[PDB]
Amino acid sequence: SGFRKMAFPCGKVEGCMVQVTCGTTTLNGLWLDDVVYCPRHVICTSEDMLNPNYEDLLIRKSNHNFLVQAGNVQLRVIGHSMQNCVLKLKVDTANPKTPKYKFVRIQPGQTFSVLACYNGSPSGVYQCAMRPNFTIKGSFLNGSCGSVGFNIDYDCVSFCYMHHMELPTGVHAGTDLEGNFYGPFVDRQTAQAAGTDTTITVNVLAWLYAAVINGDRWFLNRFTTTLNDFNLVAMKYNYEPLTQDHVDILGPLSAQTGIAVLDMCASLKELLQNGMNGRTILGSALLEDEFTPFDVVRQCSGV
Amino acid sequence: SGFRKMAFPCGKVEGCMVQVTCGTTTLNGLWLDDVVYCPRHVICTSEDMLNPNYEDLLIRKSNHNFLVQAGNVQLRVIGHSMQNCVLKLKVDTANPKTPKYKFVRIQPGQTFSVLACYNGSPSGVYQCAMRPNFTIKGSFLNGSCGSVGFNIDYDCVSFCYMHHMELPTGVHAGTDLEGNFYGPFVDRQTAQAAGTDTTITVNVLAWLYAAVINGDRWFLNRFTTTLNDFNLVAMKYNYEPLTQDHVDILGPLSAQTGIAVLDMCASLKELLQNGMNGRTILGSALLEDEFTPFDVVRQCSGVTF
Ligand SMILES: *[C@@](O)(CO)[C@H](C[C@@H]1CCNC1=O)NC(=O)[C@H](CC(C)C)NC(=O)c1cc2c(OC)cccc2[nH]1
Ligand SMILES: *[C@@](O)(CO)[C@H](C[C@@H]1CCNC1=O)NC(=O)[C@H](CC(C)C)NC(=O)c1cc2c(OC)cccc2[nH]1
């Protein structure tokens, strides 16, 4: 029993992080087989980063312009290309610690583990959720560009995120491993705003089931609601609408606890209209939305 | 920027996790050089665990009754001994992935990363604080015993926790790597209850220095206090008393902000006595007590290992 924000063990990714330096600019890269992936803005100078014509800057670079260090060893770049915002540095040595891996694009509301690195050295690991406005609430300082987010299924690492930027509001943005940004952001040195953030409703409900499995029931009530009447109220509070697919994904948690999904929606509607009266749920004073149904099932199955 | 509960990268520990079985009883162990460390109750049957005599139960066992597996590879056991509630099993292969390491016994309030494991396979990692009642608010399922907690300093892994028990209330209890429980618990299949918990004062202060560093400082008052007066007041709110070590580890954050520890204590004292007054700190109206001063430093300064 217990419920905690939990990340995947990150050893398989640790063995892939390297340092990439071009000029006076240094960040992290991801070394898989004989390719090192890193944010392309590493080729920029301070003045370039203001409005980088990346294809122009890139053609003017040579392989020897790129210093790639893996621990003590320096890797020799034998080629360089660009895939959207991701620089691909070819090296003469394949990483022997390359796990089975895949590149995937995560959807909003889904979670992943982030391995935060500095100068190519892993510094910490934590779980994040892709917000509906395609930002993430991470913990990233100068030099963390090139850090990657990932899930693991069996022995296969699914890479979904590479970090590029911190918005003025302090949330974070980045790309998939094909170099496409999540959201409407751009890798230039400008202050950028995200769209209006909404709350991930299916995740809040999963976390309410988790609280019940762990003995917290004070927010429960006898009422039920229709799906549409629930969504009318949820939208009013800037919650995403709950789809029938979401209802279905919650099935296992409904079964385990014996609380129908539409019953638990009536509790959430009461919480949104009434607040929490200074009470807490799983130790939190706010309604937590960064836990997926599957995050809950995998920690609370059998409890 | 941003502030999260962050674990240490756990690769160096994953390469050390193994499975230990005796009869049908299975749990996790820690493979360092040519020794495997694990909870001694692996030698119990389900019925033995009700009222075990571990000395008696161990006299019955030989090296060849112990199944130790790294993945599906068996490590032959060539010696065995018991130290408090930990079993040590000598094996015929020195772990080639052994990191630089040490065994440490941490204080209440200290945090550590937990590598949750099942059948010798790491499954998740998360951060925990040792509560003042010597429990941890963990997330542990059946088969998790022998999971370890650790910190990483430079390249050295400091092991501080081995998992043994879930209490009725849903919190967790265990030992250090020398087999000595944190708290008044015993490894026996019985419902045991922990003392009343308290708030970790040194960590709340750390979190307040964090807020100041970030420009959020409305709560700073013009008062100061003695350490003894603060301790006596803090206890009336269920806050833990500060030690000299606590004052000393707050030193860096005190110098960084220019706010003396006892001045921050007088500010915290006011927050306790008058409440928050509809205001928040770092986004929260709840005072946070599971970040140590090193966590605050490590996260606001990006230290690596
Ligand atoms: C990478 O380390 C750069 O290599 C760095 C990410 C962070 C810096 C602090 N916390 C982080 O996560 N990323 C940047 O510095 C990016 C670089 C771009 C993509 C070329 N820049 C920003 O994130 C950024 C720029 C600006 C800005 O300008 C003007 C104004 C306001 C906010 C802002 N964020
Ligand atoms: C280990 O995996 C045992 O090998 C297991 C830890 C958990 C089980 C569920 N979640 C966990 O973290 N530990 C136990 O099962 C221990 C075994 C002891 C050390 C012999 N027992 C308990 O944790 C336990 C027993 C009882 C109990 O009795 C009856 C009554 C109430 C609570 C309780 N917890």
Give the start-to-end residue ranges of the domains of chain B. 13-91, 99-175, 201-301
Token output for B218: 């409305």
- Token pair 């660009």 is at which residue? A82
Token output for B259: 């706010």
| Contact predicate A136/A129, CB 8 Å | yes
Q: Shortest CA distance to A292 belongs to which of A111, A159, A134?
A: A111
Residue whose CA lies nearest to ligand 2 atom number 4: B145
Q: What angle do CA B201, B202, B204 make, to 5 degrees?
A: 65
Q: Which amino acid is at B164?
A: H
Mutate to test the pocket of ligand 1, among A119, A145, A188, A192 (most ligand atoms within 8 A of CB): A145
Contact A172/B at CB under 8 A: yes
C-alpha A215/C-alpha A138 separation (Å) is 30
Assigned fold of A201-300: main proteinase (3clpro) structure, domain 3 (1.10.1840)
Please, which residues have CB within 8 angstroms of residue B235's CB and are 6 or more apart in sequence?
A: B241
3-state secondary structure of A157: strand
Which DSSP symbol is given to B194?
P
Q: Shortest CA distance to A92 belongs to which of A75, A72, A105?
A: A75
B77-83: strand order across its sheet: B73-74, B67-70, B17-22, B25-32, B35-39, B86-91, B77-83
Q: For residue B192, which ligand has an atom nearest its CA? A: 2
B38 to chain A nearest CA, in Å? 20
Asked if A123's CB is within 8 angstroms of B9's CB, the reply is yes
A17-22: strand order across its sheet: A73-75, A66-70, A17-22, A25-32, A35-39, A86-91, A77-83
Provide DSSP, A172-221. EEEE-TTSPBSSS--SSSS---PPPP-B-HHHHHHHHHHHHHTT--TT--
Q: Which of A38, A145, A160, A300 is catalytic?
A: A145
Catalytic residues of B: 41, 145
- Token pair 């809950």 is at which residue? A296
Please give the span between the terminal C-alpha atoms of chain A, in angstroms, as a whole number.
6
C-alpha B149/C-alpha B123 separation (Å) is 14
A85 to chain B nearest CA, in Å? 22
- Phi, psi values for residue B264, rounded to 5°: -60, -40
Element (H, E) at B254: helix B251-257
C-alpha B208/C-alpha B287 separation (Å) is 9
Chain B contact set for A126 (CB, 8 A): 4-7
- The alpha-helical segments, DSSP class H, found in A33-173 are 54-59
Longest dimension (CA), chain A: 69
| Beta strand segments in chain B, E | 17-22, 25-32, 35-39, 67-70, 73-74, 77-83, 86-91, 101-103, 111-118, 121-129, 148-153, 156-166, 172-175
Q: Class of the B13-91 domain? A: mainly beta
Give the nearest chain A residue to B153 (CA atoms). A123
Using CB atoms, pick whichever of B124, B172, B300 lies closest to residue A7: B124
C-alpha A214/C-alpha A59 separation (Å) is 58
| Beta strand segments in chain A, E | 17-22, 25-32, 35-39, 66-70, 73-75, 77-83, 86-91, 100-103, 111-118, 121-129, 148-153, 156-166, 172-175
C-alpha A175/C-alpha A106 separation (Å) is 10
Mutate to test the pocket of ligand 2, among B118, B145, B181 (most ligand atoms within 8 A of CB): B145
Ligand 1 touching residue A140 (CB < 6 A): yes
| Contact predicate B191/B97, CB 8 Å | no
3-state helix, strand, coil in chain B (%, to 5): 25, 30, 45
Neighbours of B302 (CB within 10 A): 19
C-alpha B91/C-alpha B227 separation (Å) is 51
Mutate to test the pocket of ligand 2, among B87, B164, B182 (most ligand atoms within 8 A of CB): B164
Q: Shortest CA distance to B75 belongs to which of B24, B38, B45?
A: B38
Asked if B286's CB is within 8 angstroms of A280's CB, the reply is yes
Element (H, E) at A14: helix A11-14
Q: Are strands B73-74 and B148-153 parallel, antiparallel or unpaired?
A: unpaired
Q: Which residues pair with B151 in a beta bridge?
A: B158
3-state secondary structure of A273: helix
C-alpha B169/C-alpha A297 separation (Å) is 20
Asked if A138's CB is within 8 angstroms of B6's CB, the reply is no
C-alpha B292/C-alpha B269 separation (Å) is 19
Token output for A168: 């003025």
Q: Are strands B156-166 and B101-103 parallel, antiparallel or unpaired?
A: parallel
Please list, residue by residue across B284-298, b when 16 or more beta carbons sit within 10 angstroms of its beta carbon and e when fewer do. Answer: eeebbbbbbbbbbbb
Q: What is the sign of the dihedral through the CA atoms of A131, A134, A140 and A144? A: positive
Q: What angle do CA B131, B136, B139 make, to 5 degrees?
A: 155
Token output for A15: 């063995």
Contact B9/A at CB under 8 A: yes
Q: Burial-class residue B101 by CB neighbours within 10 Å (0-12, 13-18, 19+).
A: buried
Asked if A138's CB is within 8 angstroms of B4's CB, the reply is yes
Among the four given CATH numbers 1.10.10.10, 1.10.1840.10, 3.40.630.10, 3.30.10.20, the one describing domain B201-301? 1.10.1840.10
Which DSSP symbol is given to B14?
H
Experimental method: X-ray
CA B225 to chain centroid, in Å, comes to: 31
C-alpha A120/C-alpha B304 separation (Å) is 10
- Token pair 């065995």 is at which residue? B80
Asked if B1's CB is within 8 angstroms of A121's CB, the reply is no
Residue whose CA lies nearest to ligand 1 atom number 1: A145
Please, which residues have CB within 8 angstroms of residue A189's CB and are 6 or more apart in sequence?
A: A49, A50
Breaks in chain B at C–N > 2.5 Å: after which residues? Answer: none
Among the four given CATH numbers 1.10.10.60, 2.40.10.10, 2.60.120.10, 3.40.50.10470, the one describing domain A15-91? 2.40.10.10
A20 to chain B nearest CA, in Å? 17
| Contact predicate A90/A34, CB 8 Å | yes
Decide if A44 is catalytic. Answer: no
Which DSSP symbol is given to A170?
S
Fold match between B13-91 and B201-301?
no
| Contact predicate A162/A147, CB 8 Å | yes
Per the document, the length of chain B is 305
Please list, residue by residue across B35-46, b when 16 or more beta carbons sit within 10 angstroms of its beta carbon and e when fewer do. Answer: bbbbbbbbbbee
Q: Shortest CA distance to B235 belongs to which of B267, B281, B196?
A: B196
Using CB atoms, pick whichever of B125, B138, B172 lies closest to residue A9: B125
Q: Which residues pair with A80 in a beta bridge?
A: A89
Q: Are strands A156-166 and B25-32 parallel, antiparallel or unpaired?
A: unpaired
Longest dimension (CA), chain B: 69
| Contact predicate A66/A89, CB 8 Å | yes
Q: Burial-class residue B82 by CB neighbours within 10 Å (0-12, 13-18, 19+).
A: middle
Token output for A78: 């034998």
C-alpha A151/C-alpha A155 separation (Å) is 10
Which DSSP symbol is given to B145?
T
3-state secondary structure of B230: helix
Q: Which residues pair with B118 in a beta bridge?
A: B121
Element (H, E) at A297: helix A293-300
| Contact predicate A122/B9, CB 8 Å | yes
CA A103 to chain centroid, in Å, comes to: 14
Contact A143/B at CB under 8 A: yes
- Token pair 């059948």 is at which residue? B119
Contact B298/A at CB under 8 A: yes
| Contact predicate A16/A5, CB 8 Å | no
* Experimental resolution (Å): 2.0
Q: Which residues pair with B90 in a beta bridge?
A: B35, B79
* Cα distances (angstroms) measured from residue A96 to each of A12, A119, A295: 11, 20, 31
Q: What angle do CA B296, B196, B178 make, to 5 degrees?
A: 65
Assigned fold of B99-175: Thrombin, subunit H (2.40.10)
Q: Are strands B148-153 and A100-103 parallel, antiparallel or unpaired?
A: unpaired
Q: Shortest CA distance to B16 belongs to which of B72, B130, B112, B94?
A: B94
C-alpha A64/C-alpha B14 separation (Å) is 36
Size of interface A-B (CB pairs under 8 A): 124
Contact A2/B at CB under 8 A: yes
Contact A168/B at CB under 8 A: no
Residue whose CA lies nearest to ligand 2 atom number 8: B142
| Contact predicate B142/B123, CB 8 Å | no
Please give the span between the terminal C-alpha atoms of chain B, in angstroms, as a whole number.
20
C-alpha A174/C-alpha B2 separation (Å) is 15
| Contact predicate B134/B194, CB 8 Å | yes
> No. of H helices and E strands in chain A?
8, 13
C-alpha A192/C-alpha A17 separation (Å) is 28
What number of CA atoms fall less than 13 Å from residue B89's CA on the CB side? 33
Asked if B4's CB is within 8 angstroms of A139's CB, the reply is yes
